């Protein structure tokens, strides 16, 4: 279980250490063979290598079987050239590993329904996995320009593109509740009809998985009126972006969501939250995201689905007994990691 | 107050008649000089003129001071050539009058907070107006094709396009709570940057209006976690679609929301809902959308803001006292219109 840790900056190291604490325990008491070393990354790496994604980190991720990344960003670099802003290192990291699927989970933990903006009855049972296309769509396509009179961007998709992400969606379903929802806008866009066609063609290989299609705007509605009826949601770039951000508000608060970036290289698991450099080092940051990101890696990078389900539960338990400040409590980082530890 | 009524098909005529019943009463009791004639439109017009938007209808809307349209669509024509499908008639109608702004309101009426999927506290006070670009964006741009290996669509916007919709947005704000939120995806797309630029440029003229910008996905979040802090929301085509459908579920169900199409021609007011051919004629359809549509026309096409606010209230009233089947009740179309009438 070799893992490359890229703590980053802000509460990055903070939340990453906690996940490591939980990980070392889980490993020690289970014999996992977890082996790891911390690598400079983002603004941190910048302060010692000039670049946010240095050469030894690139090698560190390569030779690693998974990546447990924290957070990057900060004012100390918000005024540096793009090519080397910490943000860009995330893109270089992604690209170096060919990460084409960004798994964005959104689950309301039992007992935490009142933390959500949805009535306790709708928030109850919510456990969706939004798989979004990472390297295609209107985000990168050409042409694309601006002028005094007009601007333009291009949403293009290729059969190999859509096939491998949909492929990732069906495999993940097989391990969840076996149901996927390909989202698109096929009723008014060629790409949508093209996205549908391909996914349907790829679903045939996964008969044990139920494929249901839906329009992007219609799906926005059912994500707020019936989130629980959804398991795995596969979709394109810009829409993945919108649907992922939408699902992210369903479970109480954003500092509770993990993240993963699957592709052809070393997977990368990380908290969706920012670096919050202001609260950095004040021990007040909630390590739930980082810890749950650690779960994600166990299940998705090593298949330890049970162990991951364990950690998840422990967190859910801790969020209840010793809730963090953001959850209307007072359990600082250190404290909260202890309680999580318990359920381990 | 000359009005052109295009009942259309499905529950089109059903829900339209109701609004007209409310209308005739409001007029009779207050002397409004409401004058109107119904015109063949959509699938209906197709079975008498071969085309969805016949010549006398075109003339009917032209000479008309406002259009109160119902619904269009049905199986009877789902298989006819595009240039003649009922759906296209809407596009011809919209173009014929240079309508480029779809006003999609979403307000949770006081006392109806429990009808929303959002906690009573967040659904309280919600009254947003989502202004969406109707004739541009990725919806129409070229190129746009399909092939075995790939598909493509083009999102392009022109200074003149973004200026007039944003114009509409600011004038509408002046009459509401004086706040606008231009939505886009400037942080990753040329068009977004372009959209922002222009709207900023147009806002200068409306200093008394507060202009706040937001990204599409981020906005998706605040529309579920903080709807109340929003008044007027202006945005592009596809995004207007997504954000308008989203805000449509905040107040309860979709058959409750009206619609408007502002531009340089005869404005058209219509219920967002579909034609529901199946339930057509079985007096089970909820005329709330159609009647609300009729209120929108009163304020937005005649300025009778008080009268419009009156109808609105009566509908809120009747949706409580004599709720429709969709609202967990059993007050058929004819029944419901009577109660609405009362509050008039």
Of B138, B188, B246, the CB nearest to A220: B246
**Structure-token pair, residue B280:** 């057509």
CA distance B270 to chain A (A): 19
Beta-carbon contacts of B207 under 8 Å, excluding residues fewer than 6 positions away, are: none
Cβ of A150 and B188 within 8 Å?
Answer: no
Distance CA A244, CA B214 (A): 17
Distance CA A269, CA A256 (A): 14
Of B194, B221, B244, the CB nearest to A249: B221
Alpha-carbon distances, residue A46 vs A57, A83, A89, A174, A297 (angstroms): 12, 12, 10, 41, 26
Give the Cβ contact number of residue A88 at 10 Å.
Answer: 18
**Structure-token pair, residue A268:** 């990368």
Beta-carbon contacts of B90 under 8 Å, excluding residues fewer than 6 positions away, are: B42, B72
CA distance B225 to chain A (A): 6
Of A117, A119, A241, the CB nearest to B217: A241
User: Catalytic pick from A95, A98, A139, A326?
Assistant: A139
Residue B217 bears catalytic tag: yes
Alpha-carbon distances, residue A240 vs A131, A137, B217 (angstroms): 7, 10, 9
Asked whether A53 and A67 are in contact (CB, 8 A), the reply is no
**Structure-token pair, residue A120:** 């306790």
User: Catalytic pick from A107, A185, A206, A317?
Assistant: A185
Can you give the length of chain B in residues? 344
B191 contacts on A by Cβ (under 8 Å): 151-153
Of B193, B216, B218, the CB nearest to A146: B193
Cβ of A144 and B118 within 8 Å?
Answer: no
Q: Which H, E and C letters describe A200-262, residue by residue?
A: HHHHCCCCCCEEEEEEHHHHHHHHHHCHHHCCEEEECHHHHHHHHHHHCCCCCCHHHCCCEEE
A238 contacts on B by Cβ (under 8 Å): 185, 216
Q: Which H, E and C letters describe chain B, residue by residue?
A: CEEEEEEECCCHHHHHHHHHHHHHHHHHHHCCCCEEEECCCCHHHHHHHCCCCCHHHHHHHHHCCCEEEEECCCHHHCCCCHHHCHHHHHHHHHHHCCEEEEEEEEECCCCCHHHCCECHHHHCCCEEEEEEECCCHHHCCCCCCCCCCEEEEEEEEEHHHHHHHHHHHHHHHHHCCCEEEEEECCCCCHHHHHHHHHHHHHHCCCCCCEEEEEEHHHHHHHHHHCHHHCCEEEECHHHHHHHHHHHHHCCCCHHHCCCEEEECCCCEECCCCCCCHHHCCCCCCCCHHHHHHHHHHHHHCCCCHHHHHHHHHHHHHHHHHCCCHHHCCCCCHHHHHHHHHHCC
Residue B187, φ and ψ in degrees, nearest 5: -70, 0
Residue A241 bears catalytic tag: yes
Degrees to nearest 5, angle at CA A151 with A150 and A153: 150
**Structure-token pair, residue A314:** 């422990």
**Residue A174 CA neighbour count, 13 Å, CB half:** 13
Nearest to B240 by CA among B118, B157, B142, B302: B157
Nearest to B29 by CA among B304, B256, B331, B336: B304
Distance CA A102, CA A293 (A): 13
Q: A336: burial class by Cβ within 10 Å (0-12, 13-18, 19+)?
A: buried
A151 contacts on B by Cβ (under 8 Å): 156-157, 190-191, 193-195
Beta bridge mates, B133: B101
CA distance B329 to chain A (A): 19
Nearest to A249 by CA among B233, B120, B219, B228: B219
**Structure-token pair, residue A124:** 């109850």
Give the Cβ contact number of residue B118 at 10 Å.
Answer: 25
Residue B185 bears catalytic tag: yes
Residue A107, φ and ψ in degrees, nearest 5: -125, 130
Of A144, A195, A249, the CB nearest to B224: A249
Cβ of B151 and A224 within 8 Å?
Answer: no
Cis peptide before A284 (omega within 30 of 0): no
Count of pairs with CB atoms under 8 A, one residue in A, one in B = 150
For chain B, what is the largest distance between any 2 Cα atoms, rounded to a whole number of angstroms?
64
Query: Is B280 marked as binding a ligand?
Result: yes
Distance CA A113, CA B240 (A): 30
Cis peptide before B276 (omega within 30 of 0): no
Cβ of A246 and B249 within 8 Å?
Answer: no
B217 contacts on A by Cβ (under 8 Å): 241-242, 244-246
Of A118, A151, A195, the CB nearest to B190: A151
Cβ of A119 and B122 within 8 Å?
Answer: no
Query: Is B24 marked as binding a ligand?
Result: no
**Structure-token pair, residue A270:** 């990380």
CA distance A255 to chain B (A): 14
A177: left (phi over 0), alpha (psi -120 to 50) or beta: alpha
B1-344 topology per CATH: Isopropylmalate Dehydrogenase (3.40.718)
Query: Is B286 marked as binding a ligand?
Result: yes
First to last CA, chain A: 18
A241 contacts on B by Cβ (under 8 Å): 216-217
Distance CA A153, CA B239 (A): 14
Asked whether A249 and A243 are in contact (CB, 8 A), the reply is no
- Chain A interface disruption, residue of B155, B157, B250, most A CBs within 10 A: B155
Distance CA A233, CA A127 (A): 11
Residue B157 bears catalytic tag: no
User: Catalytic pick from A9, A184, A231, A241?
Assistant: A241
Cβ of A154 and B152 within 8 Å?
Answer: yes
Residue B245 bears catalytic tag: yes
Q: Which H, E and C letters describe chain A, residue by residue?
A: CEEEEEEECCCHHHHHHHHHHHHHHHHHCCCCCCEEEECCCHHHHHHHHCCCCCHHHHHHHHCCCCEEEEECCCHHHCCCCHHHCHHHHHHHHHHHHCCCEEEEEEECCCCCHHHCCECHHHHCCCEEEEEEECCCHHHCCCCCEECCCEEEEEEEEEHHHHHHHHHHHHHHHHHCCCEEEEEECCCCCHHHHHHHHHHHHHHCCCCCCEEEEEEHHHHHHHHHHCHHHCCEEEECHHHHHHHHHHHCCCCCCHHHCCCEEECCCCCEECCCCCCCCCCCCCCCCCCHHHHHHHHHHHHHHHCCHHHHHHHHHHHHHHHHHCCCHHHCCCCCHHHHHHHHHHCC
A146 contacts on B by Cβ (under 8 Å): 190, 193-194
Give the Cβ contact number of residue A254 at 10 Å.
Answer: 17
Report strand pairing: B179-184 vs B232-235. parallel
User: Catalytic pick from A245, A310, A313, A326?
Assistant: A245
Report strand pairing: B150-158 vs B232-235. unpaired
B137: left (phi over 0), alpha (psi -120 to 50) or beta: left
- Quick one: CA dihedral B122, B246, B253, B307, positive or negative? positive
**Structure-token pair, residue B318:** 């009747």
- Chain A interface disruption, residue of B151, B155, B239, most A CBs within 10 A: B151
Distance CA A166, CA A159 (A): 10
Query: Is B54 marked as binding a ligand?
Result: no
Query: Is B84 marked as binding a ligand?
Result: yes
Asked whether A269 and A4 are in contact (CB, 8 A), the reply is no
Distance CA A113, CA A119 (A): 8
| CA dihedral of residues B133, B138, B140, B141 (deg, nearest 10) | 120
Q: Measure CA B311 to chain center.
A: 17
Distance CA A195, CA A200 (A): 9
Asked whether A133 and A159 are in contact (CB, 8 A), the reply is no
Radius of gyration of chain B (CA): 20
B252 contacts on A by Cβ (under 8 Å): none
Q: Calculate helix-pair angle for B55-63, B86-96, nearest 10 degrees.
A: 40
Q: Measure CA B220 to chain center.
A: 19
């Amino acid at each position: 279980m070799k893992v490359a840790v890229l703590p980053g900056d802000g509460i990055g190291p903070e939340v990453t250490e906690a996940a490591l604490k939980v990980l070392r325990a889980l490993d020690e008491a289970e014999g996992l063979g977890l082996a790891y070393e911390v690598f400079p990354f983002g603004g941190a790496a910048i302060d010692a290598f000039g670049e946010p994604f240095p050469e030894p980190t690139r090698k560190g991720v390569e030779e690693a079987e998974a990546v447990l990344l924290g957070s990057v960003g900060g004012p100390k670099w918000d005024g540096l050239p793009r090519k080397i802003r910490p943000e860009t290192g995330l893109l270089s990291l992604r690209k170096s590993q060919d990460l084409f699927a960004n798994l964005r989970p959104a689950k309301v933990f039992p007992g935490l329904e009142r933390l959500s903006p949805l009535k306790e009855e709708i928030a109850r049972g919510v456990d969706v996995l939004i798989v979004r296309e990472l390297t295609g769509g209107i985000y990168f396509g050409e042409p694309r320009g601006m002028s005094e009179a007009e601007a333009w961007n291009t949403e293009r998709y290729s059969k190999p593109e859509v096939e491998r992400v949909a492929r990732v969606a069906f495999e993940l379903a097989r391990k969840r509740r076996k149901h996927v929802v390909s989202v698109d806008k096929a009723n008014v866009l060629e790409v949508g009809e093209f996205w549908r066609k391909t996914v349907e063609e790829v679903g045939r290989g996964y008969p044990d998985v139920a494929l249901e299609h839906q329009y992007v705007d219609a799906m926005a509605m059912h994500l707020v009126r019936s989130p629980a009826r959804f398991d795995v949601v596969v979709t394109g770039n810009i829409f993945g972006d919108i649907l992922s951000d939408l699902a992210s508000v369903l479970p109480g608060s954003l500092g509770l969501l993990p993240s993963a970036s699957l592709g052809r290289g070393t997977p990368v698991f990380e908290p969706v939250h920012g670096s919050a450099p202001d609260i950095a080092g004040k021990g007040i940051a909630n390590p739930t995201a980082a810890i749950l990101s650690a779960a994600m890696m166990l299940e998705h990078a090593f298949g330890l689905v049970e162990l991951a389900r364990k950690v998840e539960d422990a967190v859910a338990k801790a969020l209840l007994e010793t809730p963090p400040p953001d959850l209307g409590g007072s359990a600082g980082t250190e404290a909260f990691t202890a309680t999580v530890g318990m359920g381990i």
